[PDB]
Swiss-Prot record:
InterPro entries: Maltose/Cyclodextrin-bd (IPR006060), SBP (IPR006059), SBP_1_CS (IPR006061). It comes from Escherichia coli (strain K12). Transmembrane segments: none annotated. The complex is composed of two ATP-binding proteins (MalK), two transmembrane proteins (MalG and MalF) and a solute-binding protein (MalE). This is Maltose/maltodextrin-binding periplasmic protein. It comes from the Bacteria. Part of the ABC transporter complex MalEFGK involved in maltose/maltodextrin import. Binds maltose and higher maltodextrins such as maltotriose. Induction: Induced by maltose and the transcriptional regulator MalT. Permanently repressed by cold shock in a PNPase-dependent fashion.
Amino acid sequence: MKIEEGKLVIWINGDKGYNGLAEVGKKFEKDTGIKVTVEHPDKLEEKFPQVAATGDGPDIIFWAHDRFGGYAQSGLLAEITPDKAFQDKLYPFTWDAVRYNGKLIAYPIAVEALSLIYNKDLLPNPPKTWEEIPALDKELKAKGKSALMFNLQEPYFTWPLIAADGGYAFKYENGKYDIKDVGVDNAGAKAGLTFLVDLIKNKHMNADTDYSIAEAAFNKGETAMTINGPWAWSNIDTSKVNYGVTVLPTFKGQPSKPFVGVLSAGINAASPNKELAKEFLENYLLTDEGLEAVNKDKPLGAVALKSYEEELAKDPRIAATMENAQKGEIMPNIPQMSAFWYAVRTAVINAASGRQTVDAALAAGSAQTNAAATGQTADWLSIIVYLTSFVVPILLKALYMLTTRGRTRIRFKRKPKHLYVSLPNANSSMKAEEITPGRYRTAVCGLYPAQIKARQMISPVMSVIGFLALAKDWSDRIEQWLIEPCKLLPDTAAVSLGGPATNRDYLRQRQVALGNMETKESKAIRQHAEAAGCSMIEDIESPSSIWVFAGAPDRCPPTCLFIAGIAELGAFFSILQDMRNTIMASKTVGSFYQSYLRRTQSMGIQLDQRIIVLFMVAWGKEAVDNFHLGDDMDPELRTLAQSLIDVKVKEISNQEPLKLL
Ligand SMILES: OC[C@H]1O[C@H](O[C@H]2[C@H](O)[C@@H](O)[C@@H](O[C@H]3[C@H](O)[C@@H](O)[C@@H](O[C@H]4[C@H](O)[C@@H](O)[C@@H](O)O[C@@H]4CO)O[C@@H]3CO)O[C@@H]2CO)[C@H](O)[C@@H](O)[C@@H]1O
């Protein structure tokens, strides 16, 4: 019933052999004294992330592997660490389905694919091709029957036709899926779907048809054929029916291409029974003895366990199932898959009912598939508020951790709390509130510049470009910069009291512009920061105006963007990074600026690159001369060197050995 550090709660879909699985639980209770309660709620897969985080989900979730990539990125799933020996008991390709970013996120149980099921008494010559189905329907309809009924409400069942002439979710190439290359709106997808919609319009199928009616219809002897998976076989046997299982029909001479699912078992990251769950699955469920009990309720299909699979292989129906799988494609596990299914589902319904044209349906689906695929930009107001909540020292400490070569979510830590920095995988799509390590350096720096000054936090990216020499003499350096005459521009009759123009006049002219471009979004950020104790900058001549860049943010922080002339300051250091990297490459006998530039524009600014020029002419050589090009001693040298000395200094004469210098 309830998650407790003893008890186990398991969730599995209601179309699977949950009763047989419950039998395994009873066996588990007998040997170890641990009750196993099996439930099969509707829509378990949507609710789970909602309960997973609130202490109320199951310890173990069973589903096909496609949802699990999404679960793992959110950190909802416990890491799997089976013996090397154990991996070898199950087929390797099954691990691939449940492999994400090199990490195991669930145990595979069984491989499921759709097949064509036909009544051998009614239809001893099943069709080879889809396109013959229509001619076949007229004769049978004349005898009170139909050709084919299946669930149009789930895109899984229609996808094989849609995939038949070339449709794909995401293109697989060079070992991975291209999340921006979606094939739902290609020539192939439009052809395949059109064929199905006409079957309906010609009253061969009814758009208003789901899983339960059709099984019954087939089972009642009303329809010659159905499309379903191995789980359906149990109820058909009960209905007293002679059926066959064969390859799906072809379409346009191309094989039908079902999406193949691997039934998988994930462990809830918040479960207090992680050790128990692992013990349960490998030693009880994932056994010859265990799987038969499940299989005896409703067949699982082609199981992952080699020892058991050798037995199943004798069933001719599974041979056909695996035939369809090899002609099709293994489902992705990527997070965007759910977005994909939702899109195709609406598209099938909308098209099937004639509420929209096919072109539009699949076109809209295309848009929606990339909706999740495209990279959202940050809502800093939501990031700042999340960072400001945490105490100030905890945050500062985290920055020093990002730069120690740590290596999905990295965790930072009379009430306990947990800070989470989310690393971006190449597959996952940027969220509007996803705090990346880069965005993290950005927010904190813009919030706590003066507090960074106290700790003197210069990263190994800024330390090398001589950031200290500019920092200490900053206050005196910057005023020289301001008092200096900006000859080139503006036209010199504009000062407030030297006869010549000054650079200060430029930053002024600039601030007016920024004051106009100052977005309500930015203002909102600036004020919320102050109230949280995050006192901020207001001018370039501030004690901590330059300490905003000490942490090496990827962007000009959002709390300083419209305070001239910081926005252009950024490129100054960013270029220096490009300068060194090209100096070193030159030294040998044989991009940062561009990136930084791109990111600021993402915030809606046009960098007055002239200000950058000015910053150079003043602090060019100074910053360049004091670069740290040369390398230094190796840790082995230093440690080994000092030790040898110590000995000799311990021997003659026993005096404190002073270090190497
Ligand atoms: O849109 C409203 C509907 O949303 C919910 O269904 C969604 C799921 O949340 C998605 O995960 C996805 O479902 C896929 C599923 O991921 C995939 O594994 C496959 O499911 C098979 C399953 O592998 C197989 O073992 C067997 O159980 O049949 C399933 C198919 O019925 O295919 C699903 C897509 O068809 O997309 C659906 C929506 O399409 C919610 O559960 C629904 O109740 C709701 O109506």
